[model samples]
Target: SEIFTLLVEKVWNFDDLIMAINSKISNTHNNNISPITKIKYQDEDGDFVVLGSDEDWNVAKEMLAENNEKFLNIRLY
Candidate 1:
């Protein structure tokens, strides 16, 4: 299998992120998969936090948007 790296742009919140993923799956793959099992971001302390759920996303403070940009490291199948 090949590794396909996708960037979900302008994700201001968890719901937006979900929508973007679903949209991409629908438009590109023509099918939907499960909720992302692994989404990671490093904090100032260099600790990786997994934002796999909505609760995790809500609790994460390090990846909040700055200057209209927030970057996340996502691993999806």
Candidate 2:
């Protein structure tokens, strides 16, 4: 389950990054997608937080990285 653990860690970290991005853009006039549900941490103690299926996580990771890079590049240039 090491891969699962790693995937969960990646999802957990990415969730944090996504929240930060959402916070920064919260007051903007334009519509933007945000994480509607907060991520479940280990301490919650009920069902283990299921990040998503591996394929779904992979897709999300790709899209998130692409969008983040685009946003950063636009801000810099």
Candidate 3:
């Protein structure tokens, strides 16, 4: 999770989760920007999870995102 630290301006809140998700959608996974296949994130309980925009990708080192979903407090791989 990297965004949390980068966002040193705003006070932290779960409401930021929505912004993270949409930011992810626009820049990382969906909307044809980067066309990512697999995404790593944390659920409500802070359990790590994986999701795919269309389908799963090989979660290999070379294919992962440079950024992290620190808002979710979850590791990206």
Candidate 4:
């Protein structure tokens, strides 16, 4: 198991948020950034949190949607 932390900016909506995250993951994998420890996307309003793993991502998204908040600060294990 591993933890990947990243910052996703320009997040107007979930689609944009996910796209930025996907781009970050792709770049990180290609750049072999795993040599370091885990990362986030924070703005003036708040942060957009997402846990590792695809399943966890979905779960986080669900809660985010239900809460109907543009930003959230969540730490999951």
Looking at model 4, residue 70 earns an lDDT score of 38
Q: What TM-score against the true fold does each predicted structure earn? A: 0.45, 0.24, 0.27, 0.35
Estimate the TM-score for candidate 1: 0.45
Clashes of 4: 3
* Per-residue lDDT of candidate 3, residues 26-77 (tens digit): 5655653322323354433345555453232223111233333223423333
Ranking by TM-score: 1, 4, 3, 2
- Count of backbone clashes for each model? 0, 0, 1, 3
Cα lDDT of model 4 by residue, 1-77, tens digit? 33334433332244544545446555555634332223233322354444344555555555545655435332223
lDDT of 2 by residue, 1-77 (tens): 21111122244345554445455544464423653333322211222333433444454456545544211110100
Prediction 2 TM-score vs. true: 0.24
Candidate 4: RMSD over Cα atoms? Answer: 7.4
lDDT of 3: 0.36
Predicted structure with the largest TM-score when compared to the true one: 1
- Among all candidates shown, the one with the greatest lDDT: 1
Give the C-alpha miss distance for residue 51 in model 4, angstroms.
Answer: 2.2
By lDDT, rank the candidates, best first.
1, 4, 3, 2
Q: List runs of model 4 lying over 4 Å from the truth.
A: 1-37, 40-50, 72-77
- RMSD of model 1, in Å? 4.9
